Design a protein around this ligand. Structure first.
Ligand code: MMA
Ligand code: MAN
Lengths: 232, 227
C-alpha cells in the first residue's frame, strides 16, 4: 500500500498486529518494553522491542517517491532507584530486524557492541558522549551507524508521560521531533535526512528499550502512525 | 489498534503485506485473483484470494464497541467467452482463513461443498434471477441473504464502495461503472453474531469450466472502533 495508518489509544492484552521481541509484553493496557516483576517494578538486565506487523513502504525508486510520515506516542519511565536507565527509542529498520546480540544497556537493544533511523530518549550516563552533556539525559536522533547526530538536553521525570510527535517531510527531508510533558514543558530537535540513503524501500517501525545494571520501566502507553508516498 | 487504514492505488509486484492464496498473483500492476496464461488470457479451473496481513479489530466485547468500516475497490472481468465465470468477492473472515477444499467454480473459493461476511459479484448461472449475474451479500453459511441484479461488462472497471455503520448495523454496497450505471444493495447485519473480534479482509475469485480474469485494480480500506 502507498498509504498506511493505525492508532493504539491504549494497548489491551489481546494484540494481533504487534511483533514482540525480547522481554516486551503487554501489562496494564500498556506495552512494557522492559521486564517488570509481579509488582510492576523494573528489573535489571532486560531488553525488549515491538514492531508493527505491516511493513511500511518508505520510498519507491521506480516512481521517485518518498513517504511523508508521522509517529505520535507517549511513554513513561519509573524507577525505585535515583538513576533509572537506560532509555527508550522509536526506530525504523529493515523488515527482518531483530535484537542484536549484546545490545543491552546503553545500546538500547538497537545496536550491536547498520540501516536504521531512530529517536532515542536516554537517561543513562555515557563516558565519551561527544554529542551531548553526559551529566544529563538527552534526546538524540540516530542515522545509520551514527548515534546522536543531533541531540537536545532533556529532563527525566519519574512516572510522567512524555507526549512525542516525530514527523518526516520528504520535501524538505526534515525529521522533526517534538516532545512535551503534561505541564507543557517542551523539547525540540530536528535534522535533515534523506531516508533513501540509509533505509531500504520497505521497512518496519516500532520501539526498543533496555536496562543494564541500572534500570527503569519503559512503558509505551499509546501510539498512532501514518505514512503516505508522495512524489518528490 | 482501534483504527487501521491502508490504500493501494495500484498493485506493483513488490508486495509485502498481502497474503496470497491459491493462484492469486500480481500482473500488470493489478492483482490477478485467478490464473492467466503467458498471453494474459484467463484459464479454466482456478481459485485465488488475497488477505491484507494486518488484522482488523472489528468489534470488542469488553468495551461494547463495534467498528465502522469502509472498503473501496475496483475490478474488471475479461473473457473470450460470452459466459465468463464465476465471480469475485470482497470478504471478511477469521484471520487464519484458507481456501476451503473443493471451493472452486461457483463456490468462489469462499465456501466448502463458517464465519464470514462477503459481497459477491457473480456472473455465472435461489434468491436471484439465474437469467442474469447478481451481487449478493453472504452472512455466515447463508449465501445471498440478499441480492440485486447486476450487469457484467467485459473489460470495464466496476468501482465499489462497501460500508458498515455500527449504529444502524447496515452493510451498504454501491457499485458503478464509468458511465454512471449504479447498483446498490444493503442488509442489516450484527457483525458480532457471525465474526470474531479480530478478522482479516480481502478478496476471493474462481473459475470452473467457464472462465474470466478477476482483476483487482485498486483497494482502500479504513476501520475504527466506535462506542
Ligand atoms: C554498568 O553498566 C551496565 O549498566 C549501565 C546502566 O544500565 C548500562 O549503561 C551499560 O550499558 C551496562 O549495561
Ligand atoms: O465455471 C462454471 C461452472 O463450472 C463447473 C463448476 O466448477 C461450477 O461450480 C461452475 O459454476
Amino acid at each position: 500500500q502507498d498509504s498506511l495508518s493505525f492508532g493504539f489509544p491504549t494497548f489491551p492484552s489481546d494484540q494481533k498486529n504487534l511483533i514482540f521481541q525480547g522481554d516486551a509484553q503487554i501489562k496494564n493496557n500498556a506495552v512494557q518494553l522492559t521486564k517488570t516483576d509481579s509488582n510492576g517494578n523494573p528489573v535489571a538486565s532486560t531488553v525488549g522491542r515491538i514492531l508493527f506487523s505491516a511493513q511500511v513502504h518508505l520510498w519507491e525508486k521506480s516512481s521517485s517517491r518518498v513517504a511523508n510520515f508521522q509517529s505520535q506516542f507517549s511513554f513513561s519511565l519509573k524507577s525505585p532507584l535515583s538513576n533509572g536507565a537506560d532509555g527508550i527509542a522509536f526506530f525504523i529498520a529493515p523488515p527482518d530486524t531483530t535484537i542484536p546480540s549484546g545490545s543491552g544497556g546503553g545500546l538500547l537493544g538497537l545496536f550491536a557492541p547498520n540501516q536504521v533511523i531512530a529517536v532515542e530518549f536516554d537517561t543513562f550516563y555515557a563516558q565519551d558522549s561527544n554529542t551531548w552533556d553526559p551529566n544529563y539525559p538527552h534526546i538524540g536522533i540516530d542515522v545509520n551507524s551514527i548515534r546522536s547526530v543531533k541531540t537536545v538536553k532533556w529532563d527525566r521525570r519519574d512516572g510522567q508521560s512524555l507526549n512525542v510527535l516525530v514527523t518526516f517531510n520528504p520535501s524538505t527531508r526534515n525529521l522533526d521531533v517534538v516532545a512535551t510533558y503534561s505541564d507543557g514543558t517542551r523539547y525540540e530537535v530536528s535534522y535533515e535526512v534523506d531516508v533513501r540513503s540509509v533505509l531500504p524501500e520497505w521497512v518496519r517501525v516500532g520501539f526498543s528499550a533496555a536496562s543494564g545494571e541500572q534500570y527503569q520501566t519503559h512503558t509505551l502507553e499509546s501510539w498512532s502512525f501514518t505514512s503516505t508516498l508522495l512524489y518528490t
